[PDB]
Symmetry: C3
Subunit: 121 residues, 3 copies
C-alpha cells in the first residue's frame, strides 16, 4: 500500500512506506502527488473554541492552491473525506484561515492510494 498522514502535532509527516512511491512530502500540511491514480483523503479538523483573532473560521483542503473542500463549522471537530483522481505534480495541502483557530494537536489529514488505472494518466 501507499499511505501518508500529517499530524496531529507534534507528529509531522508519517509515510508508509517511509519513502513511498505515490507521494512526496513538501512541508508541514503539504504533499505532492507522484503517481497518477485514485486517492482517498481523510482527516480531522479540531477548532480551537478559545480563538481570539480576526478571521472567520475556515479550513480548506486544496489542490494546486484551490480549495476542493471547505470546513466552516467552529463548534465541533469535523471529519473530512473524499475520493479524487490526481495527477503527478498535484500539490495537496490543508490550509487554515488562521493557525490559531485550530487545535493542531488534534488536527490531521492523510491520503491512501486506492488504485492506479491506466486511464488516470
Amino acid at each position: 500500500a501507499c499511505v501518508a498522514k500529517f499530524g496531529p502535532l507534534p507528529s509531522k509527516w508519517q509515510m508508509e512506506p517511509p519513502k513511498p512511491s505515490c507521494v512526496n512530502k513538501i512541508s508541514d500540511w503539504k504533499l505532492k502527488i507522484l503517481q497518477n491514480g485514485l486517492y482517498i483523503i481523510y482527516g480531522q479538523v479540531a477548532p480551537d473554541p478559545t480563538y481570539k483573532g480576526f478571521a472567520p473560521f475556515e479550513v480548506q483542503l486544496c489542490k494546486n492552491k484551490e480549495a476542493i473542500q471547505t470546513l466552516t463549522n467552529n463548534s465541533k471537530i469535523q471529519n473530512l473525506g473524499g475520493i479524487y483522481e490526481f495527477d503527478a505534480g498535484d500539490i495537496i495541502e490543508l490550509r487554515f484561515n488562521s493557525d490559531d483557530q485550530v487545535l493542531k494537536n488534534n488536527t490531521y489529514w492523510g491520503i491512501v492510494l486506492l488504485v492506479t488505472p491506466q486511464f488516470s494518466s
Copy 2:
C-alpha cells in the same frame, strides 16, 4: 478483508469473516472497533413517510456516543458514507430520534477495513 453490515431487518449483524479480527458486534446497530486503522462506513437510511410521533427526523452515526454524521431529510432514502481513522475500543452505532420514524426493513449500515497503518495507533 474485514467487513460487517447490520440490517436491513430482519437481518442483524452480518460479518465477513464471521468472527472478524477488525470489529466485534455489541448489540443491534452497534459495534466495537478492535483494530486501529482506516475504515470506510456506508449505509442507507429509509424514512417512514407515515411517521406519527413527536420527534423531528434525525438519524445519527455516532462514535463513542457523539454524532459524526447526522441525516435530517425525511423525504427520501439517504445514503451515508465516510472514511475515518478509528482506535481499538471505539464504539460505532447508528441512532434514531425515534425507532418509528425509519423503515428498519430498508435501513442498514456497514463498515469495511481499508488499511491498518502503523500511524493509526
Copy 3:
C-alpha cells in the same frame, strides 16, 4: 481490480480490464452493475460559465433513474464521491439538466469495485 471511467470527452467509456466482470457500459454516461458489492463512485462536474439556456444548474448521479446525488453549484468544478452497495442490474448514470450547462471536456465519472461481500446479495 475492476474500475471504469466515462470521459472527459472526447474519451468515452474506459474500462479496466476492458471487459470487466463488475460492470457493463450501456451508453454515454451510463453503465450497468453486474456484480453485487460495495462500489466507490468518483467524478468531476465542470460547469460551463457561459451557459445561455433555460435550465437551472443541476447534475444528478442516478441509480435506476433516481438521483442519489445532486450537484447544483454553477460557480466551480464540483467533485463527487460516494460509497454504495449496488445490486446486479442497477443502472448508474450521470444526468445533466442541460447538456449545454456543463463542459463535457472536463466532466467525468467513474467507479471502483471495493469488495464483494456475501451479504451484498
